[PDB]
């Protein structure tokens, strides 16, 4: 996250860190039930050096604050049983950039570990609404990951404006969130984490999944996120949640 601040300990108890064995933190995810996470499909694609698609290659840390303190009280370590990447994902366009991760043993709910609420299929997160991005990604483009979980406040951008900022790249699964003036944005290593939106009684709902961007925090280049209401039924069908 560029332009953000340190989160308070336990402020985002649905935020999860996904480590690939031997490589440290790669992506984020969100806790949605005792057994399931939501993340981004693009994080789980094999390359010639490493099989990112193989669930046995990963560790999820729940309740984490600081990447240098992964055994702190309240942090839970879990392996993955399965990675379900959306069947329509493609790694060229990044359309359908969403995956479901099945924990190998359930999470234990606590003050540090709590699921995010999922929005119904019909719910609209309106243009202009302030929402939050969180993660351990880079704090400047090309820069370094944060040890401490970061948060940043960003606003939903109108879809036609988003399309025109990133021509021939924005599908209806995507939404731009940020500022035309730049300054606050997601960045490398934030992918897969949740957008958190404060709803009408103060409960937080997941608005989207950190997906991609052109650079980070640049003028006229807000980050791109996968919309969540579109996938509510797909989540139910694949997870029972
Ligand atoms: S909607 C998912 C979360 N709800 C719960 O974990 C219910 C737990 C207890 N029954 C309770 O204390 O009410 C949730 O509300 N997450 C978002 C949030 O803002 O905390």
Numbering used by the authors: 16 to 60, 60A, 60B, 60C, 60D, 60E, 60F, 60G, ...
Wording from the paper:
Matriptase is a type II transmembrane serine protease that is found on the surfaces of epithelial cells and certain cancer cells. Matriptase has been implicated in the degradation of certain extracellular matrix components as well as the activation of various cellular proteins and proteases, including hepatocyte growth factor and urokinase. Matriptase activity is down-regulated by its physiological inhibitor, hepatocyte growth factor activator inhibitor-1 (HAI-1). Sunflower trypsin inhibitor-1 (SFTI-1), a cyclic peptide inhibitor originally isolated from sunflower seeds, exhibits potent inhibitory activity toward matriptase.
We have also determined the high-resolution structure of matriptase:benzamidine complex for structural comparison. In the structure of β-matriptase-N164Q complexed with benzamidine, the benzamidine binds to the specificity pocket S1 right next to the active site and is sandwiched by the segments of Ser190-Gln192 and Trp215-Gly216 as expected. Considering the high resolutions of both matriptase-benzamidine structures (1.2 Å in our structure) and the relatively small errors of structures (0.4 Å in our structure), such differences in benzamidines are significant, and indicates that S1 pocket is larger than the molecular size of benzamidine and allows movement of benzamidine inside the S1 specificity pocket. This is consistent with the observed higher temperature factor of benzamidine (40 Å2) comparing to the average temperature factor of protein (15 Å2). The point mutation removes a glycosylation site (N164) and allows the protein to be purified to homogeneity. Comparison of the conformations of matriptase in the benzamidine- and SFTI-1-bound forms reveals that they are nearly identical except the side chain of Phe99 at the S2 subsite, which will be discussed later, and Gln192 at the S3 subsite. Gln192 side chain is solvent-exposed in the benzamidine-bound structure and forms the lining of the extended active site groove.
